[PDB]
Amino acid sequence: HNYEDIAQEFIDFIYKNPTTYHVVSFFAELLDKHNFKYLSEKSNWQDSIGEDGGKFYTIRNGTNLSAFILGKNWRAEKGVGVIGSHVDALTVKLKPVSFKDTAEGYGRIAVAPYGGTLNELWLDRDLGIGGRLLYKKKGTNEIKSALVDSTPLPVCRIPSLAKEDQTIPVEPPTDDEKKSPLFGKHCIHLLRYVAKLAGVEVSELIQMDLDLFDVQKGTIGGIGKHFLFAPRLDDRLCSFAAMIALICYAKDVNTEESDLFSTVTLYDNEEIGSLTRQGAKGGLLESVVERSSSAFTKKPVDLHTVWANSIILSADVNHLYNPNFPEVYLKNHFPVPNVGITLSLDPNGHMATDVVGTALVEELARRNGDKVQYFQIGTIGPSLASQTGARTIDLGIAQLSMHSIRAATGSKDVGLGVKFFNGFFKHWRSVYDEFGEL
Amino acid sequence: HNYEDIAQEFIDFIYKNPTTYHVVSFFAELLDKHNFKYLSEKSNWQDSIGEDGGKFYTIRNGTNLSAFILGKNWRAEKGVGVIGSHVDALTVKLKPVSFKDTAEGYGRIAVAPYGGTLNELWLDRDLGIGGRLLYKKKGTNEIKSALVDSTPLPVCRIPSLAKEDQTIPVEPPTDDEKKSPLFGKHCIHLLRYVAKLAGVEVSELIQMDLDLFDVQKGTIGGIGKHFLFAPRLDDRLCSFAAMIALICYAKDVNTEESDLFSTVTLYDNEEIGSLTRQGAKGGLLESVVERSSSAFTKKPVDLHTVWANSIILSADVNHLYNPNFPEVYLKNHFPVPNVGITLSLDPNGHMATDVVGTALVEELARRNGDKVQYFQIGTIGPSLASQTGARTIDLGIAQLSMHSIRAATGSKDVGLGVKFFNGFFKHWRSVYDEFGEL
Amino acid sequence: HNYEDIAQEFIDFIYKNPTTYHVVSFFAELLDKHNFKYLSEKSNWQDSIGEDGGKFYTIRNGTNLSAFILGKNWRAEKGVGVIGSHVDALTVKLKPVSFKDTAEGYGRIAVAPYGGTLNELWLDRDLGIGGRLLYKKKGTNEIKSALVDSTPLPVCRIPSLAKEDQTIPVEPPTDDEKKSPLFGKHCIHLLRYVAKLAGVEVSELIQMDLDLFDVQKGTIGGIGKHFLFAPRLDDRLCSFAAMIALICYAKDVNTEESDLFSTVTLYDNEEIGSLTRQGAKGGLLESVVERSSSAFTKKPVDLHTVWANSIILSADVNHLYNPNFPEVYLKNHFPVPNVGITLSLDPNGHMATDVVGTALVEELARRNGDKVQYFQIGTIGPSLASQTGARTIDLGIAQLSMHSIRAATGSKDVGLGVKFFNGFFKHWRSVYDEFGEL
């Protein structure tokens, strides 16, 4: 009510955090200012998690984040309430050696598509450069990370004609600059430019993982302002909604009076099939849960009983009804904007032969005043379901023109998404109890 | 000998138990009247399994069942004797919203194929409706399950012309009926009909997972009665044979005088690639074994040693020689009916480079008086083998016209299958001992 | 009213009488227990038909039957009320030499499709064997006929792969057995099997004309039981309805108080184009009428005047609206189930330019309380019309999936068909009188 924007907050979030690194870093800052404590995955957690439980988060690779709330009174039979989503998006990436010699004076860079064989939709769009630099300051032996972002400067673009065709229109090297490990691999100007943004010298740059992304800020749109146009909606839209839902929920939770175990886990490499250590199949969720339950109590914890009592919402976007292409959609099985969360059903696929998860989500929405929509036609749901043995439901916030460089969704859909996910954390355990043995 | 029918018992079993729900439920009743004890997967088993071991079974989702016999004197070095098979079959499923408005007075329903893009073989067949309903009785807060089956009434059929073409030819709503969660999603008549079968009100129906299946009862066939014609043979044929084998074997087992760990595990979603929590990759088998060995003894159990000493028969059907298509078959590598179990060999595939499993099965058959046949050309064998590290052999009972709505096999093949599997449980440990380190 | 089953009687009739031989034999038994007298076509009828007229039937080839009621007071100007239909159906036939040598131990038989190049619809269906055997008992010189039927035993099936491809999966010869004329032509087991069914020796078998047919019994179907699923509906459905109509009508007829000449004639070989001596072009109808009118009175009978005053209903099935394929059907010219008889209209074809027959059928239905449906898009109507000169109307009971091995129609359609045809015999003469010269 007037606070369904929130859509502006989302638009600012996509605009200010273009790469996966930025998104994870942004959530890290948001979590710890809500008193979630960072745990290194490289250290054992026995002495970091106690009888009281608490609020925590861990990070793998700077692109895979898990945030969790563990109750003082949690036990195996309570299970875990999980929302799983992905934070990688389709982009163009600077190649390891991005160096191209001039084409009639034009400066260019070797780049590769990430997550697809990219569209004509990427042509004639203003593209910023940004992501992660690795560097070693002089007279040190620590390799540190810096985040870099050219916004609002579009440093390049893939021109249409009015890795041969899709290429990009973008003084002498100092002795020190030649000492850099990246000297031959990237043109000196680009290196000088990223070095400037990070606040380090060119000679100190070890490596980089840079994207090219649309710098056009998102907008509320439509004559009645029913829509939201923005880049990278898949699946930063569900990720944002789930994380904000968890943090709003965490507000009213003293972990000492809780018997729940709740988590939002955000994965990398969904666009690539998820079979990486930062992806859904790398098992960060399962790692978090086993570690937490191990560190938390002296008693042994039966993980099979934990997962048998758990519910995983595998949150990934569905397709809005495109009124221009009615034939691809199935009648009575397509979502519309500004209504509510969409349940992905597929006759083949992991949720066929599981009517219970569908029923549970319907009951939740009923209790919380939400609406649910249907959509029948390396996704993380099947991976997580089979990896844990826990009942998993595929759903999400529907959008138009998915895997476009600029997608569309309802202007109320971020808020409705946060609302549904907030309701899930509050009620899933109670609602799942009445299915009993099922 | 006269008791190789058993084929009638099988025919009655397929006829009376059309969906996966019915099949699992049927086995649950058979097991517990043979004194197997049900364990909830949602409860820890420490205090349900003791020093004596025992006979048990557990169920996941109503479609994934594991039955096991744990010996009082079992130890890691004995391993597990496993038969793994699947109970899902190709069917048509009622869509989540099955509602179609009338086509010139004809009533119809939206349905989807499960496990394939379905055949012309499904045209002009009498189709019953059946499966699982979820319901909540009035003034309650328990969601219960009921099984429903229209047999012998064919409620519908997919007509040939003498999800556009393959669709199906099948008073006013009470206020109470409109109160049902499924009111808009399925036509009132269908809801009234399934409600009647379950013995509940329409208003009490929460959700349903219904199939459409062939109601034509199986028959012994051929002029010399050499064949068995029936629906859903893949892989309810191996599942039946393996379960009956285990139960016949269990008869002569006092668990107090046993040092063996035996199981038949039945999976869902093999036709869909097995990557679901109810499928082979959901790890019910491994869950059962870890839980049992944990609960059973105070000593710690090395699971790697258990699997290194185990044998898994991954039981799935092979192809009978179709004399009409000799060229697709490979000479000296095709099974015939009424001879015995068929070993699936594949030069690429998980049993290439493992001659030991083949040798073991041959030795077993030799000892038990069985015959073995060969067949070289998300299967569960590779999944289970890699998931456990245990030596796994793909084999099964061969059939004709697999993935037809009505398949064929030997009339003696159910009995021979039970015979072979019964021999396996009796002798595998002894036979595998002489391979020693291999 | 409660007696619109009648659908069960029809289902039992198709089930118990699989071949044309069985169907004709069945009608022969029904007719003569309703006091119709058999006339041999090989004997002159002068002294078998008298001044009183009577109820009669004759048979050609065991597959072509004519039943008629001749009134004592009949005259040329009264004409004949004719229903013409066919009793042959699409089947597979055993070839004259059905012998195939074993294919890896499998027994097989050479067969040919009758009436089409047969469907994938014939694959994986349980097939019985049955039809006519000719035999000569030992020390005799009479060649007799026996009917044979394996129902409910499916002796074979045409397998799908999971006259090359469509072929069929099915001790030493006695000296006497080698003496049979069919010894080399059919495998000894099949011959022994059919000999057993007939109650004769193998050595006594002269010849056989055997079909392979679906042994699946028909069912009432649909959630509201609106449908009838059964094999061989075309055109045993109209044949049954017409014959039962005649017999119900014959009940209230003393031939001594009648001035009508009524007949139902059932033809063979409609699926083959009708140009056989047992088909519509073999002229059994015309033969019956000329013979009867010759034998019946001493006065000469003008046959041209008889036919000029006659009405022939050429009863053959039309197509039900298949809601899955709306585009093949013509709006306002397609029948629905459980409504009534369907009039076949075709802008090209023999009923174009004859509006009078259509009008007469409409008037009949009006008088008898029937409903009439339309269907615009070697048929017997054109043959009979041109052969007699008599006004002929094409109509019938509509069905789905015609020329499938299992077709569908209304559950009320047999009864409505009998009702319409019964009304026709009662009123055609009276209704046709008001068209006068037309």
Author numbering:
A (entry chain A), B (entry chain A), C (entry chain A): 3 to 164, 177 to 184, 196 to 402, 410 to 470
Original paper wording:
When expressing S. cerevisiae mApe1 (sc‐mApe1) lacking the N‐terminal propeptide, we predominantly observed isolated dodecamers when imaged at identical protein concentration and buffer conditions, indicating that the propeptide stimulates the trans‐interactions between multiple prApe1 dodecamers. Due to the presence of smaller particles of putative mApe1 hexamers (white arrowheads), we stabilized and purified sc‐mApe1 using a GraFix gradient 29. Based on the twofold and threefold end‐on views from class average analysis, we determined a low‐resolution negative stain structure at 24 Å resolution by imposing tetrahedral symmetry (and EV1E). Class averages of sc‐mApe1 dodecamers including views of twofold and threefold symmetry. Fourier shell correlation of the EM reconstruction of the sc‐mApe1 dodecamer indicates a resolution of 24 Å. In the crystal, ct‐mApe1 is present as dodecamers, which are formed by two asymmetric units each containing six ct‐mApe1 molecules. The ct‐mApe1 X‐ray structure is compatible with the dimensions of the sc‐mApe1 EM projections and fits very well into the tetrahedral low‐resolution EM density. Comparison of twofold and threefold views (left and right) of the determined 24 Å resolution EM map of Saccharomyces cerevisiae mApe1 (sc‐mApe1) (upper row) with the simulated 24 Å resolution map of the ct‐mApe1 X‐ray crystal structure (lower row) shows very close visual agreement. A black sphere represents the N‐terminus where the propeptide would emanate from the dodecamer. Moreover, the geometric positioning of the N‐terminal propeptide on the surface of the dodecamer is consistent with our observed trans‐interactions of dodecamers leading to higher‐order assemblies.
The earliest discovered selective autophagy pathway in Saccharomyces (S.) cerevisiae is the cytoplasm‐to‐vacuole targeting (Cvt) pathway, through which hydrolytic enzymes are sequestered into double‐membrane vesicles, termed Cvt vesicles, and transported to the vacuole 8, 9. The best‐characterized cargo component of the Cvt vesicle is the vacuolar aminopeptidase I (Ape1) 16. Ape1 is synthesized in the cytosol as a 55‐kDa zymogen that includes an N‐terminal propeptide (hereafter referred to as prApe1), which oligomerizes into a dodecamer 17, 18 and further assembles into larger aggregates in a propeptide‐dependent manner 19. In addition to prApe1, Atg19 also binds another cargo hydrolase α‐mannosidase 1 (Ams1) 25, 26 via a site distinct from the prApe1 binding site, thus forming the Cvt complex.
